[PDB]
Design an enzyme around this catalytic site. Structure first.
Site, mmCIF file in Angstrom:
data_model
loop_
_atom_site.group_PDB
_atom_site.id
_atom_site.type_symbol
_atom_site.label_atom_id
_atom_site.label_comp_id
_atom_site.label_asym_id
_atom_site.label_seq_id
_atom_site.Cartn_x
_atom_site.Cartn_y
_atom_site.Cartn_z
ATOM 1 N N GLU A 35 10.450 76.577 12.862
ATOM 2 C CA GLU A 35 11.053 75.267 11.817
ATOM 3 C C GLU A 35 12.053 74.177 12.531
ATOM 4 O O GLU A 35 11.967 73.263 12.298
ATOM 5 C CB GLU A 35 12.101 76.193 10.803
ATOM 6 C CG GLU A 35 10.927 76.726 9.576
ATOM 7 C CD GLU A 35 10.246 75.792 8.799
ATOM 8 O OE1 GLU A 35 10.401 74.546 9.176
ATOM 9 O OE2 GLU A 35 9.304 76.257 8.190
ATOM 10 N N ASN A 46 11.067 64.156 5.012
ATOM 11 C CA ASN A 46 9.557 64.322 4.295
ATOM 12 C C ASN A 46 8.881 63.182 3.694
ATOM 13 O O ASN A 46 9.814 61.927 3.420
ATOM 14 C CB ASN A 46 9.770 65.389 3.325
ATOM 15 C CG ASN A 46 10.253 66.847 4.085
ATOM 16 O OD1 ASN A 46 9.702 67.245 4.895
ATOM 17 N ND2 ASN A 46 11.352 67.298 3.622
ATOM 18 N N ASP A 48 8.077 62.560 0.807
ATOM 19 C CA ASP A 48 8.706 62.290 -0.516
ATOM 20 C C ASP A 48 10.060 61.750 -0.555
ATOM 21 O O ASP A 48 10.793 61.576 -1.598
ATOM 22 C CB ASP A 48 8.548 63.469 -1.493
ATOM 23 C CG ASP A 48 9.539 64.947 -1.174
ATOM 24 O OD1 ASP A 48 10.181 64.685 0.096
ATOM 25 O OD2 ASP A 48 9.705 65.667 -1.824
ATOM 26 N N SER A 50 12.883 63.473 0.768
ATOM 27 C CA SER A 50 13.807 64.496 0.944
ATOM 28 C C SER A 50 13.734 64.776 2.389
ATOM 29 O O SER A 50 12.965 64.170 3.085
ATOM 30 C CB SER A 50 13.145 65.891 0.130
ATOM 31 O OG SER A 50 12.068 66.231 0.677
ATOM 32 N N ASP A 52 14.594 67.896 5.324
ATOM 33 C CA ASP A 52 15.021 69.232 5.731
ATOM 34 C C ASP A 52 15.968 69.423 6.774
ATOM 35 O O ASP A 52 16.091 68.792 7.668
ATOM 36 C CB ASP A 52 13.690 69.768 6.299
ATOM 37 C CG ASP A 52 12.617 69.816 5.402
ATOM 38 O OD1 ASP A 52 12.556 70.055 4.268
ATOM 39 O OD2 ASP A 52 11.414 69.828 5.840
ATOM 40 N N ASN A 59 15.294 72.357 2.335
ATOM 41 C CA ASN A 59 14.984 71.015 1.930
ATOM 42 C C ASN A 59 16.062 70.531 0.656
ATOM 43 O O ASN A 59 16.480 71.110 -0.181
ATOM 44 C CB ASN A 59 13.644 70.994 1.317
ATOM 45 C CG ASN A 59 13.226 69.641 0.824
ATOM 46 O OD1 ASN A 59 13.195 69.187 -0.380
ATOM 47 N ND2 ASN A 59 12.392 68.929 1.715
ATOM 48 N N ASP A 101 13.116 83.338 -4.745
ATOM 49 C CA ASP A 101 12.983 82.301 -5.851
ATOM 50 C C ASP A 101 11.450 82.740 -6.530
ATOM 51 O O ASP A 101 10.920 82.202 -7.535
ATOM 52 C CB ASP A 101 12.822 80.807 -5.468
ATOM 53 C CG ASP A 101 12.946 79.961 -6.083
ATOM 54 O OD1 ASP A 101 13.440 80.070 -7.475
ATOM 55 O OD2 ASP A 101 12.049 78.994 -6.221
#
Ligand code: NA
Length: 129
Positions: A35, A46, A48, A50, A52, A59, A101
């Protein structure tokens, strides 16, 4: 801060990640390597909109607030910048929420694609833990 492999493994162990929800330490170290290359200051934007953040590339669409991701949530209740600290506590505490989650570590695309189903124990071999 750029961690060494064993240094990070120790830090994660001390913060309760070894076998957290059944993921052995090597899993967490492997996910961090791919990562962020073990760099707490890593950021990546990203498609979209967003971003990270940090060693585990958490995110802003769901997990932290960066003030620039419209319609997003802040499920870890932290500014995204807290995730960039040399102190990994906030990243670890948020990662524990994420991995709980529903999808386990599959939440981390790099884990799924580069760590899952590999000899992850290799990531902590040789370390004093
Ligand atoms: Na957010």
């Amino acid at each position: 801060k750029v961690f060494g492999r064993c240094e990070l493994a120790a830090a994660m162990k001390r913060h309760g990640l070894d076998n957290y929800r059944g993921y052995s330490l090597g899993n967490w170290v492997c996910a961090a390597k791919f990562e962020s290359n073990f760099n707490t200051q890593a950021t990546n934007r990203n498609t979209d909109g967003s971003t990270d953040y940090g060693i585990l590339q958490i995110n802003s669409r769901w997990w932290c607030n960066d003030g620039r991701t419209p319609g997003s949530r802040n499920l870890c209740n932290i500014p995204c910048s807290a995730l960039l600290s040399s102190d990994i506590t906030a990243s670890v505490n948020c990662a524990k929420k994420i991995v709980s989650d529903g999808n386990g570590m599959n939440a981390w695309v790099a884990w799924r694609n580069r760590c899952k189903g590999t000899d992850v124990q290799a990531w902590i071999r040789g370390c004093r833990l």
